[PDB]
Amino acid sequence: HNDEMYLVVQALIRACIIKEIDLYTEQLYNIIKSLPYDKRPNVVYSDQPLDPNNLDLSEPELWAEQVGECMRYAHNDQPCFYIGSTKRELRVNYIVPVIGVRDEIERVMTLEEVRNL
Amino acid sequence: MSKLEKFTNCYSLSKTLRFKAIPVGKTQENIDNKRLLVEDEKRAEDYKGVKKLLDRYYLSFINDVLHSIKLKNLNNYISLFRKKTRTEKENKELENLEINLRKEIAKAFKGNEGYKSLFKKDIIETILPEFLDDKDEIALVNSFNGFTTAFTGFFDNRENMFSEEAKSTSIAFRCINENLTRYISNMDIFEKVDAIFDKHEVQEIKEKILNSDYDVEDFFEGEFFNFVLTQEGIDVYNAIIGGFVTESGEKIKGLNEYINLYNQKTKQKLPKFKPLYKQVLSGYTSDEEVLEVFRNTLNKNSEIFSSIKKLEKLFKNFDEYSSAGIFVKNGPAISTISKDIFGEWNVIRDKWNAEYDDIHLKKKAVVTEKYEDDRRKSFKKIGSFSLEQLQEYADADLSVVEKLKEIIIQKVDEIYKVYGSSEKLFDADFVLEKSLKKNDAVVAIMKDLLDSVKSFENYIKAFFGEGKETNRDESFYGDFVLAYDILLKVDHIYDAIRNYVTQKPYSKDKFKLYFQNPQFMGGWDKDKETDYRATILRYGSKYYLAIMDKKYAKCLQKIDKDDVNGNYEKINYKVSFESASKKEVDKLVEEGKLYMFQIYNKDFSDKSHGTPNLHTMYFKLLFDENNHGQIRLSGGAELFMRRASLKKEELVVHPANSPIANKNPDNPKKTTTLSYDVYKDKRFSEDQYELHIPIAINKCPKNIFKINTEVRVLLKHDDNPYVIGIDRGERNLLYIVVVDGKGNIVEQYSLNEIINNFNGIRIKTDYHSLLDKKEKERFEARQNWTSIENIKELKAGYISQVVHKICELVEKYDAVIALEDLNSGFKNSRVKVEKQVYQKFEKMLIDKLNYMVDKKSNPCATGGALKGYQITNKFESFKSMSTQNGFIFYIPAWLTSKIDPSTGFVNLLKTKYTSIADSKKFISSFDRIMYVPEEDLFEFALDYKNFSRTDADYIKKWKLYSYGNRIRIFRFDWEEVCLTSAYKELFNKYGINYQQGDIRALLCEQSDKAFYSSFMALMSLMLQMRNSITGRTDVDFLISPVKNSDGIFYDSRNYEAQENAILPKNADANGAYNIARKVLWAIGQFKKAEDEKLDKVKIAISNKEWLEYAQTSVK
RNA sequence: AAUUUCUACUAAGUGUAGAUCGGUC
Ligand SMILES: [Mg+2]
Ligand SMILES: [Mg+2]
């Protein structure tokens, strides 16, 4: 019960991380659903733990299309973030908003969502 | 009076209603306790087995018919085909003899060998059970007792196959035309040069290994064409020339590989034989299967990429071949290669015109638009531009094969650039753990790959000729056609992938129920009355279908009124009702003796306050009292049960009491809140019944007459029609012009936004900004297939809304409709609306305007569902959109956007800089170049007799000026250039006199070239009428350099922001308003012509009399 | 983002605005 509890501790670190991401997803969901679909930021999407205070701008998976339609998951009720229009079916559950359009974006844009409105 | 009194209810039209049927009571429990589910699934899968095994049985029937058929007139068609024909009406005797072969093989098809026990119940119930060994399938056949509706549909397909139509699906066209003309072609190859090829391998070794049949040299006679038409003749004949394994480890090749193996001069300029086709009868379901197809076809070392290397080696062989005899198919891509090699497109046309000017054009040119249209159809008529002809079209320092070769290595080098980023995709262990529908970059790789390969496929299919022509090259066309067919196979791979990736996440599977009756309600309570076992019950706003089980329907007719409650009126008089009771049929349903499926939709709800749909208003006026016979029922009502697609795991909701945002920025509210659940696509997670009720409208007509003649008679006495220009625009994507009969603008407006009307509330919704953001999505998604399908279907809903607006214009104004035409031969490729979507627009005009129904009118009078308007004939083909269809007046349009709406001047001066000789001739053609200091403008009094292609003017002598300023778009850069500052910039520059009149000879005194080039530049800016910005939408104005007789110039900024625009506002209103004035000219032709002369009035307008009417009728 | 199916909405609170004949590639 030495290394097993060690990887359990790693799973608990990932639990605190994914609950920080889920908490910021909830408050960020509130400030995004406060916006009338025009002052929305261009948001990086992912289906992986994306940890906005530890964002890595390395891979070409970074994308900057305007988010919308952040509705539930009605077996577990979630904020869900279609990255395009209604009819693109690109639902995700991990988002980080950034500055503007594509190509070597700026870095983080943390907690400036009230300055978008 | 009005013009709508005679065009109502003229002819018949059938429709198919669709409504919602849900189970009521214990009907689902009785279907579960009578075992109606396994026999429809098993019977359906066995039906797919019947379609497969009748493809196989009909394949054996083709094997039986085409086996023992001999020919008699074979040698005459061969010989007279290859005697280098002598056409004194000879080829109509040759081709008529070929028609005698078509009636010979069609006489063999129709005359004998069965032909009567083939599309009935005996081929499927008597001949099929004695066929098909491994007799479990025979037990799968006998469960189709009398259900031959999908069987008679498949029989309709299999009688559309074998007919006297001679298409690619017809076997007689394929074998006679393909196998006989390729057979005679192989005898023309085989008799000319085969003595160089071989005399020892063919008859000694190949005959011994392959067949030990008759000789291969004897296979070029009458005996073999009677044998090759079987499947074994195709297997042997393609086993000799193509090769065959010969049931060993030999894997021998054919004759063309021996032509490659002959090694005469290490070039092998020898003809190759043509392969002959087989019979006409020879995954899109998972990510890994279509991905495995991509791991089969487009990998690194396939035969497909090897055939592409045979195309590159084939253009190397083209570099060491000749340049004569290789034909080019005439189309739009000869302009594309004109842009590739030469400067512009029609330059090659002009060089063709040069040879045409060698033939028809003499001194004192008599060139008219009839000469340009006969010249254009002569350009279509040639169709056989060879490479030596393009070499004669080439000027000095213009190498066709060298610039052609460098730019095609540029194209396949760009394809190699796509392949360079495609190597690291599927190297070693490519099992992509994500979804194919989820990842973005791989779809971009395969998309750019299939777009490069498919665009190269359009280019190489533009490198065909005409076929069956004169002396043509003999080794290029073999690998050209074969690698072309391999490239058509990867075109099918593009079809499979593009049809797979855009799959929606909800599936639609409907199937008709029968309830074990092959007589299910084919009429409407006829004299049978027990074979249909179903009738329409009604209760208020809820309808109830009564399906009777046959074990109780024989003694179910006990219909008491009962005088209490629950009058379920049954339908009869095949149309009236008979009352009944309530608790009797409640006992029947609750004991399991009757089925009652509720007919209902959204519009029969009590929780509703708005205007219903159109099918519901068809259905309410169906059973109404004063139905004189307008809307009646018809047979073939079809109840489709539909399964579930969205499972219970992936449902996403809008919850209760949560203020969510709102999409439309034109919403006066910003948030909204409900007290319950709003799901995402609830209508697909259920199991649902959907009923089709086919009705017929005006089955007994009133007035059958010619529509267009009556339109031309009633508008002959009329003085004020209206015309509705619907034109594809650069910025305003759709626009509406509605003009009177005289020419004054009545109502012009744009369709960037749609005004939604509900409960008196008028809320607009813009599609210019929305589809502008959809073009932002197409501008950035790293994927476009789903994006382009969203643009296509978004424009389909958009043009449906436009269909509503045009129907409101016909129901409100009752206009004649000139809109924009698809068959004028025009192609601009600048607007955001493509051609196929507008084909769907006019297709929905044909399918909509057959019987047009207003929704908010009186059903007693005209306009409703009972007496709707019939203003457009039926649908025939895409080529039926020819100049007139009912009130839809199709009008072709040449030179309407780039023409002055005030005066009518069009771009006739070709101000492309050619040389200094035509520049001195250009300035010397001006009869009066004078300057005045008071106006500070540059006057140009000139004659249109001294210029090329300016004979279409009526006056020929005009006074021009230069007013305003221009935007020189590229020195983009936005180089805004004024008028007096440029000429005084050049005249204060170079220091010549300009303070004097009549300086047309002082301008020709210069010998430098940049003076003439800059003057041609200022003529290009002065005649550039499109004075737009192409940046922001600040001022998209249209100012003209030509004033009218009133003395004022047309500045569109003054005539835009007005309450009553007497002039058009932009180029789109210019174009559509000029099409409107073309129908004003056509009604002028209605005023010129006679009464019966209206049968043949020319409506297709020219341009010379359009310049005459455009100039001489401005006021 | 709720429909007889399709599209743009929430649009006065399990809907609202339009359009649709046909089984067949
Ligand atoms: Mg409604
Ligand atoms: Mg929708």
mmCIF file of N, CA, C and O in Angstrom, chain A residues 29 33 35-38 40 42 45 47-48 60-66 69 71-75 77 80 82 84-92 101-102, chain B residues 434 437-438 440 504-506 648-655 658-663 665 670 678-680 773-774 776-777 779-783 786-787 790:
data_model
loop_
_atom_site.group_PDB
_atom_site.id
_atom_site.type_symbol
_atom_site.label_atom_id
_atom_site.label_comp_id
_atom_site.label_asym_id
_atom_site.label_seq_id
_atom_site.Cartn_x
_atom_site.Cartn_y
_atom_site.Cartn_z
ATOM 1 N N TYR A 29 -19.180 30.149 -16.629
ATOM 2 C CA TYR A 29 -20.466 29.907 -17.271
ATOM 3 C C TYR A 29 -21.479 30.981 -16.912
ATOM 4 O O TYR A 29 -22.285 31.380 -17.758
ATOM 5 N N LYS A 33 -22.998 33.336 -19.738
ATOM 6 C CA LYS A 33 -24.437 33.397 -19.960
ATOM 7 C C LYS A 33 -25.021 34.762 -19.606
ATOM 8 O O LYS A 33 -26.180 35.030 -19.944
ATOM 9 N N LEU A 35 -23.723 37.338 -21.092
ATOM 10 C CA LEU A 35 -23.403 38.096 -22.299
ATOM 11 C C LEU A 35 -24.389 37.777 -23.425
ATOM 12 O O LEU A 35 -24.779 36.621 -23.600
ATOM 13 N N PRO A 36 -24.815 38.796 -24.215
ATOM 14 C CA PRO A 36 -25.796 38.594 -25.289
ATOM 15 C C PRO A 36 -25.214 38.130 -26.627
ATOM 16 O O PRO A 36 -25.527 38.686 -27.683
ATOM 17 N N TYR A 37 -24.324 37.127 -26.573
ATOM 18 C CA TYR A 37 -23.737 36.429 -27.725
ATOM 19 C C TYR A 37 -22.904 37.288 -28.676
ATOM 20 O O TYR A 37 -22.444 36.790 -29.708
ATOM 21 N N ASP A 38 -22.696 38.563 -28.359
ATOM 22 C CA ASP A 38 -21.920 39.458 -29.208
ATOM 23 C C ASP A 38 -20.634 39.924 -28.544
ATOM 24 O O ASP A 38 -19.619 40.100 -29.223
ATOM 25 N N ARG A 40 -19.071 38.051 -26.459
ATOM 26 C CA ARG A 40 -18.418 36.825 -26.031
ATOM 27 C C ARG A 40 -16.957 36.822 -26.471
ATOM 28 O O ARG A 40 -16.630 37.333 -27.546
ATOM 29 N N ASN A 42 -13.358 35.004 -27.757
ATOM 30 C CA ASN A 42 -12.971 33.872 -28.586
ATOM 31 C C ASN A 42 -12.245 32.865 -27.704
ATOM 32 O O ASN A 42 -11.182 33.169 -27.154
ATOM 33 N N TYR A 45 -11.200 25.703 -26.732
ATOM 34 C CA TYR A 45 -12.002 24.572 -26.291
ATOM 35 C C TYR A 45 -11.119 23.348 -26.087
ATOM 36 O O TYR A 45 -10.073 23.201 -26.727
ATOM 37 N N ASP A 47 -11.659 18.939 -24.396
ATOM 38 C CA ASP A 47 -12.342 17.892 -23.649
ATOM 39 C C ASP A 47 -11.352 17.218 -22.697
ATOM 40 O O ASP A 47 -11.481 16.041 -22.361
ATOM 41 N N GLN A 48 -10.351 17.976 -22.268
ATOM 42 C CA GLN A 48 -9.261 17.540 -21.410
ATOM 43 C C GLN A 48 -9.108 18.578 -20.307
ATOM 44 O O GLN A 48 -9.545 19.721 -20.474
ATOM 45 N N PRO A 60 -0.702 23.203 -31.847
ATOM 46 C CA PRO A 60 -1.607 23.911 -32.761
ATOM 47 C C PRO A 60 -3.088 23.637 -32.541
ATOM 48 O O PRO A 60 -3.894 23.996 -33.404
ATOM 49 N N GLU A 61 -3.475 23.017 -31.423
ATOM 50 C CA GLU A 61 -4.886 22.787 -31.130
ATOM 51 C C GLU A 61 -5.574 24.035 -30.589
ATOM 52 O O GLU A 61 -6.795 24.017 -30.391
ATOM 53 N N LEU A 62 -4.812 25.093 -30.320
ATOM 54 C CA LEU A 62 -5.348 26.380 -29.896
ATOM 55 C C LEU A 62 -6.258 26.972 -30.959
ATOM 56 O O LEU A 62 -5.854 27.146 -32.112
ATOM 57 N N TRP A 63 -7.487 27.295 -30.568
ATOM 58 C CA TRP A 63 -8.446 27.836 -31.514
ATOM 59 C C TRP A 63 -9.222 28.967 -30.855
ATOM 60 O O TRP A 63 -9.363 29.011 -29.632
ATOM 61 N N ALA A 64 -9.712 29.887 -31.679
ATOM 62 C CA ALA A 64 -10.242 31.165 -31.220
ATOM 63 C C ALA A 64 -11.556 31.500 -31.915
ATOM 64 O O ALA A 64 -11.721 32.570 -32.505
ATOM 65 N N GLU A 65 -12.504 30.569 -31.885
ATOM 66 C CA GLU A 65 -13.828 30.834 -32.428
ATOM 67 C C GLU A 65 -14.801 31.136 -31.290
ATOM 68 O O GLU A 65 -14.660 30.615 -30.180
ATOM 69 N N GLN A 66 -15.777 32.002 -31.569
ATOM 70 C CA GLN A 66 -16.646 32.552 -30.534
ATOM 71 C C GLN A 66 -17.621 31.505 -30.003
ATOM 72 O O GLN A 66 -18.277 30.800 -30.775
ATOM 73 N N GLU A 69 -24.109 28.690 -26.592
ATOM 74 C CA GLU A 69 -25.043 27.587 -26.313
ATOM 75 C C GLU A 69 -24.493 26.655 -25.222
ATOM 76 O O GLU A 69 -24.102 25.510 -25.464
ATOM 77 N N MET A 71 -25.463 24.946 -22.587
ATOM 78 C CA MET A 71 -26.562 24.361 -21.821
ATOM 79 C C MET A 71 -26.089 23.089 -21.113
ATOM 80 O O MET A 71 -24.890 22.846 -20.999
ATOM 81 N N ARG A 72 -27.043 22.288 -20.623
ATOM 82 C CA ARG A 72 -26.857 21.329 -19.528
ATOM 83 C C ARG A 72 -26.135 20.041 -19.939
ATOM 84 O O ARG A 72 -25.156 20.072 -20.661
ATOM 85 N N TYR A 73 -26.389 18.970 -19.198
ATOM 86 C CA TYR A 73 -26.045 17.604 -19.617
ATOM 87 C C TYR A 73 -27.040 16.634 -18.987
ATOM 88 O O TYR A 73 -26.630 15.796 -18.186
ATOM 89 N N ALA A 74 -28.348 16.772 -19.259
ATOM 90 C CA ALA A 74 -29.389 16.350 -18.311
ATOM 91 C C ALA A 74 -29.460 14.852 -18.030
ATOM 92 O O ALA A 74 -30.462 14.178 -18.292
ATOM 93 N N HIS A 75 -28.355 14.362 -17.477
ATOM 94 C CA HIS A 75 -28.163 13.172 -16.678
ATOM 95 C C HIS A 75 -27.234 13.635 -15.562
ATOM 96 O O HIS A 75 -27.207 13.057 -14.472
ATOM 97 N N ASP A 77 -26.367 17.399 -15.884
ATOM 98 C CA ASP A 77 -26.697 18.833 -15.947
ATOM 99 C C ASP A 77 -25.534 19.807 -16.174
ATOM 100 O O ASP A 77 -25.174 20.523 -15.234
ATOM 101 N N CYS A 80 -22.573 23.419 -21.257
ATOM 102 C CA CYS A 80 -21.901 22.940 -22.456
ATOM 103 C C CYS A 80 -21.780 23.989 -23.547
ATOM 104 O O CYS A 80 -22.722 24.746 -23.815
ATOM 105 N N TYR A 82 -20.827 24.983 -27.163
ATOM 106 C CA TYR A 82 -20.619 24.839 -28.590
ATOM 107 C C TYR A 82 -19.720 25.962 -29.101
ATOM 108 O O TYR A 82 -19.965 27.148 -28.868
ATOM 109 N N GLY A 84 -19.039 26.838 -32.197
ATOM 110 C CA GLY A 84 -19.450 27.553 -33.383
ATOM 111 C C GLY A 84 -20.880 28.026 -33.289
ATOM 112 O O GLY A 84 -21.269 28.656 -32.304
ATOM 113 N N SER A 85 -21.678 27.714 -34.302
ATOM 114 C CA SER A 85 -23.087 28.070 -34.300
ATOM 115 C C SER A 85 -23.886 26.982 -33.588
ATOM 116 O O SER A 85 -23.344 26.147 -32.856
ATOM 117 N N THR A 86 -25.203 27.002 -33.785
ATOM 118 C CA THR A 86 -26.059 25.960 -33.231
ATOM 119 C C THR A 86 -25.822 24.628 -33.937
ATOM 120 O O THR A 86 -25.701 23.581 -33.289
ATOM 121 N N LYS A 87 -25.731 24.654 -35.261
ATOM 122 C CA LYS A 87 -25.608 23.439 -36.066
ATOM 123 C C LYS A 87 -24.155 23.162 -36.451
ATOM 124 O O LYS A 87 -23.806 23.077 -37.626
ATOM 125 N N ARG A 88 -23.292 23.020 -35.446
ATOM 126 C CA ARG A 88 -21.966 22.475 -35.686
ATOM 127 C C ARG A 88 -21.628 21.295 -34.793
ATOM 128 O O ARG A 88 -20.694 20.554 -35.123
ATOM 129 N N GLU A 89 -22.386 21.088 -33.707
ATOM 130 C CA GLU A 89 -22.301 19.907 -32.836
ATOM 131 C C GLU A 89 -20.891 19.686 -32.289
ATOM 132 O O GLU A 89 -20.336 18.588 -32.354
ATOM 133 N N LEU A 90 -20.308 20.747 -31.738
ATOM 134 C CA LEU A 90 -18.944 20.681 -31.236
ATOM 135 C C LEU A 90 -19.017 20.948 -29.738
ATOM 136 O O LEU A 90 -18.356 21.855 -29.225
ATOM 137 N N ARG A 91 -19.910 20.229 -29.054
ATOM 138 C CA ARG A 91 -20.043 20.364 -27.609
ATOM 139 C C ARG A 91 -18.770 19.905 -26.902
ATOM 140 O O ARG A 91 -18.154 18.899 -27.266
ATOM 141 N N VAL A 92 -18.337 20.695 -25.925
ATOM 142 C CA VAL A 92 -17.212 20.364 -25.067
ATOM 143 C C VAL A 92 -17.594 20.702 -23.631
ATOM 144 O O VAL A 92 -18.692 21.182 -23.353
ATOM 145 N N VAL A 101 -8.710 36.790 -31.950
ATOM 146 C CA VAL A 101 -8.735 35.882 -33.096
ATOM 147 C C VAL A 101 -7.543 34.922 -33.030
ATOM 148 O O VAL A 101 -6.725 35.001 -32.107
ATOM 149 N N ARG A 102 -7.420 34.039 -34.018
ATOM 150 C CA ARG A 102 -6.338 33.045 -34.057
ATOM 151 C C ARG A 102 -4.918 33.599 -34.262
ATOM 152 O O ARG A 102 -4.696 34.807 -34.167
ATOM 153 N N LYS B 434 -9.496 9.124 -30.721
ATOM 154 C CA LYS B 434 -10.626 10.037 -30.702
ATOM 155 C C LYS B 434 -11.623 9.671 -31.801
ATOM 156 O O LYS B 434 -11.482 8.668 -32.507
ATOM 157 N N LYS B 437 -15.199 12.329 -36.323
ATOM 158 C CA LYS B 437 -16.071 13.492 -36.355
ATOM 159 C C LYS B 437 -15.684 14.552 -35.331
ATOM 160 O O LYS B 437 -16.289 15.629 -35.320
ATOM 161 N N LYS B 438 -14.700 14.273 -34.479
ATOM 162 C CA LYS B 438 -14.268 15.179 -33.424
ATOM 163 C C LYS B 438 -12.966 15.891 -33.758
ATOM 164 O O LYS B 438 -12.835 17.092 -33.501
ATOM 165 N N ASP B 440 -10.038 17.716 -35.962
ATOM 166 C CA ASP B 440 -10.194 18.797 -36.926
ATOM 167 C C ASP B 440 -9.091 18.812 -37.975
ATOM 168 O O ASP B 440 -9.364 19.061 -39.154
ATOM 169 N N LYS B 504 -25.471 13.318 -39.516
ATOM 170 C CA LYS B 504 -26.089 13.960 -38.371
ATOM 171 C C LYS B 504 -26.114 12.995 -37.183
ATOM 172 O O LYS B 504 -26.169 11.777 -37.369
ATOM 173 N N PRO B 505 -26.066 13.507 -35.949
ATOM 174 C CA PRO B 505 -26.070 12.623 -34.775
ATOM 175 C C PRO B 505 -27.423 12.019 -34.427
ATOM 176 O O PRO B 505 -27.535 11.370 -33.383
ATOM 177 N N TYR B 506 -28.447 12.206 -35.256
ATOM 178 C CA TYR B 506 -29.741 11.564 -35.077
ATOM 179 C C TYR B 506 -30.166 10.947 -36.400
ATOM 180 O O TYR B 506 -30.079 11.592 -37.448
ATOM 181 N N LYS B 648 -30.960 7.774 -24.007
ATOM 182 C CA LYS B 648 -31.222 8.516 -22.778
ATOM 183 C C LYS B 648 -29.959 9.034 -22.103
ATOM 184 O O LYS B 648 -30.066 9.694 -21.064
ATOM 185 N N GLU B 649 -28.777 8.758 -22.651
ATOM 186 C CA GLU B 649 -27.530 9.200 -22.049
ATOM 187 C C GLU B 649 -27.091 10.575 -22.532
ATOM 188 O O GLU B 649 -26.495 11.330 -21.753
ATOM 189 N N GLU B 650 -27.412 10.940 -23.773
ATOM 190 C CA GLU B 650 -26.881 12.141 -24.405
ATOM 191 C C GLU B 650 -27.940 13.228 -24.556
ATOM 192 O O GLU B 650 -27.917 13.997 -25.519
ATOM 193 N N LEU B 651 -28.876 13.308 -23.618
ATOM 194 C CA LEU B 651 -29.877 14.361 -23.651
ATOM 195 C C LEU B 651 -29.392 15.579 -22.878
ATOM 196 O O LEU B 651 -28.830 15.471 -21.785
ATOM 197 N N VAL B 652 -29.613 16.753 -23.466
ATOM 198 C CA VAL B 652 -29.149 18.023 -22.913
ATOM 199 C C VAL B 652 -30.345 18.973 -22.878
ATOM 200 O O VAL B 652 -31.110 19.048 -23.845
ATOM 201 N N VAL B 653 -30.521 19.693 -21.762
ATOM 202 C CA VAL B 653 -31.771 20.395 -21.497
ATOM 203 C C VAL B 653 -31.476 21.878 -21.264
ATOM 204 O O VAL B 653 -30.335 22.283 -21.022
ATOM 205 N N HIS B 654 -32.517 22.694 -21.406
ATOM 206 C CA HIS B 654 -32.588 24.009 -20.769
ATOM 207 C C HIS B 654 -33.416 23.839 -19.502
ATOM 208 O O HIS B 654 -34.601 23.463 -19.590
ATOM 209 N N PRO B 655 -32.864 24.085 -18.318
ATOM 210 C CA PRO B 655 -33.551 23.728 -17.072
ATOM 211 C C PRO B 655 -34.622 24.752 -16.709
ATOM 212 O O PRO B 655 -34.860 25.726 -17.418
ATOM 213 N N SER B 658 -33.941 29.369 -14.863
ATOM 214 C CA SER B 658 -32.570 29.789 -15.095
ATOM 215 C C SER B 658 -32.572 30.776 -16.256
ATOM 216 O O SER B 658 -32.962 30.409 -17.378
ATOM 217 N N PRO B 659 -32.160 32.026 -16.037
ATOM 218 C CA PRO B 659 -32.171 33.019 -17.123
ATOM 219 C C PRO B 659 -31.036 32.777 -18.107
ATOM 220 O O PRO B 659 -29.869 33.057 -17.822
ATOM 221 N N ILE B 660 -31.387 32.273 -19.281
ATOM 222 C CA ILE B 660 -30.426 31.972 -20.330
ATOM 223 C C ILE B 660 -30.371 33.143 -21.297
ATOM 224 O O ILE B 660 -31.279 33.980 -21.347
ATOM 225 N N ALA B 661 -29.288 33.204 -22.068
ATOM 226 C CA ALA B 661 -29.061 34.312 -22.985
ATOM 227 C C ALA B 661 -29.934 34.147 -24.230
ATOM 228 O O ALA B 661 -30.688 33.181 -24.370
ATOM 229 N N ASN B 662 -29.841 35.097 -25.156
ATOM 230 C CA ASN B 662 -30.653 35.078 -26.364
ATOM 231 C C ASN B 662 -29.792 35.373 -27.585
ATOM 232 O O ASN B 662 -28.921 36.246 -27.547
ATOM 233 N N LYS B 663 -30.071 34.649 -28.671
ATOM 234 C CA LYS B 663 -29.182 34.624 -29.830
ATOM 235 C C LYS B 663 -29.277 35.908 -30.647
ATOM 236 O O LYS B 663 -28.257 36.527 -30.974
ATOM 237 N N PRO B 665 -29.454 39.525 -31.906
ATOM 238 C CA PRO B 665 -29.182 40.870 -31.371
ATOM 239 C C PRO B 665 -30.303 41.871 -31.605
ATOM 240 O O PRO B 665 -30.274 42.949 -30.996
ATOM 241 N N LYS B 670 -33.336 40.549 -23.535
ATOM 242 C CA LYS B 670 -31.961 40.068 -23.538
ATOM 243 C C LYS B 670 -31.859 38.694 -22.886
ATOM 244 O O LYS B 670 -30.999 37.889 -23.253
ATOM 245 N N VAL B 678 -36.789 22.475 -21.274
ATOM 246 C CA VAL B 678 -36.718 22.580 -22.727
ATOM 247 C C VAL B 678 -35.547 21.716 -23.178
ATOM 248 O O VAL B 678 -34.383 22.069 -22.954
ATOM 249 N N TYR B 679 -35.849 20.585 -23.810
ATOM 250 C CA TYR B 679 -34.835 19.611 -24.177
ATOM 251 C C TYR B 679 -34.162 19.978 -25.498
ATOM 252 O O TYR B 679 -34.439 21.010 -26.112
ATOM 253 N N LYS B 680 -33.246 19.111 -25.928
ATOM 254 C CA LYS B 680 -32.603 19.184 -27.235
ATOM 255 C C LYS B 680 -33.027 17.964 -28.042
ATOM 256 O O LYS B 680 -32.565 16.849 -27.768
ATOM 257 N N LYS B 773 -21.211 36.045 -40.452
ATOM 258 C CA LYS B 773 -20.506 35.261 -39.446
ATOM 259 C C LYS B 773 -20.378 33.795 -39.841
ATOM 260 O O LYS B 773 -19.482 33.108 -39.342
ATOM 261 N N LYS B 774 -21.255 33.297 -40.717
ATOM 262 C CA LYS B 774 -21.062 31.953 -41.249
ATOM 263 C C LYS B 774 -19.921 31.917 -42.254
ATOM 264 O O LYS B 774 -19.237 30.897 -42.377
ATOM 265 N N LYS B 776 -17.452 33.949 -41.754
ATOM 266 C CA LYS B 776 -16.364 33.947 -40.785
ATOM 267 C C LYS B 776 -16.044 32.527 -40.333
ATOM 268 O O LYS B 776 -14.873 32.181 -40.139
ATOM 269 N N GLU B 777 -17.075 31.688 -40.170
ATOM 270 C CA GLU B 777 -16.851 30.287 -39.820
ATOM 271 C C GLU B 777 -16.172 29.531 -40.954
ATOM 272 O O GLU B 777 -15.296 28.693 -40.712
ATOM 273 N N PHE B 779 -14.276 31.048 -43.002
ATOM 274 C CA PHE B 779 -12.956 31.661 -42.994
ATOM 275 C C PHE B 779 -12.060 31.081 -41.906
ATOM 276 O O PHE B 779 -10.833 31.077 -42.069
ATOM 277 N N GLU B 780 -12.634 30.581 -40.808
ATOM 278 C CA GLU B 780 -11.817 29.969 -39.757
ATOM 279 C C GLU B 780 -12.612 28.839 -39.085
ATOM 280 O O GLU B 780 -13.435 29.055 -38.191
ATOM 281 N N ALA B 781 -12.387 27.619 -39.572
ATOM 282 C CA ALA B 781 -12.766 26.421 -38.829
ATOM 283 C C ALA B 781 -11.780 25.270 -38.958
ATOM 284 O O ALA B 781 -11.978 24.260 -38.278
ATOM 285 N N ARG B 782 -10.763 25.368 -39.830
ATOM 286 C CA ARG B 782 -9.885 24.261 -40.258
ATOM 287 C C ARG B 782 -10.671 23.078 -40.824
ATOM 288 O O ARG B 782 -10.193 21.941 -40.807
ATOM 289 N N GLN B 783 -11.858 23.353 -41.362
ATOM 290 C CA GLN B 783 -12.837 22.381 -41.827
ATOM 291 C C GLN B 783 -13.940 23.170 -42.511
ATOM 292 O O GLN B 783 -14.327 24.240 -42.039
ATOM 293 N N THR B 786 -18.890 20.467 -43.129
ATOM 294 C CA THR B 786 -20.039 20.806 -42.297
ATOM 295 C C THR B 786 -20.371 22.290 -42.394
ATOM 296 O O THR B 786 -21.544 22.669 -42.313
ATOM 297 N N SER B 787 -19.354 23.136 -42.588
ATOM 298 C CA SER B 787 -19.594 24.569 -42.723
ATOM 299 C C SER B 787 -20.294 24.895 -44.038
ATOM 300 O O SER B 787 -21.245 25.684 -44.053
ATOM 301 N N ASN B 790 -23.776 23.815 -43.786
ATOM 302 C CA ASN B 790 -24.546 24.780 -43.005
ATOM 303 C C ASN B 790 -24.874 26.023 -43.824
ATOM 304 O O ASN B 790 -25.920 26.649 -43.617
#
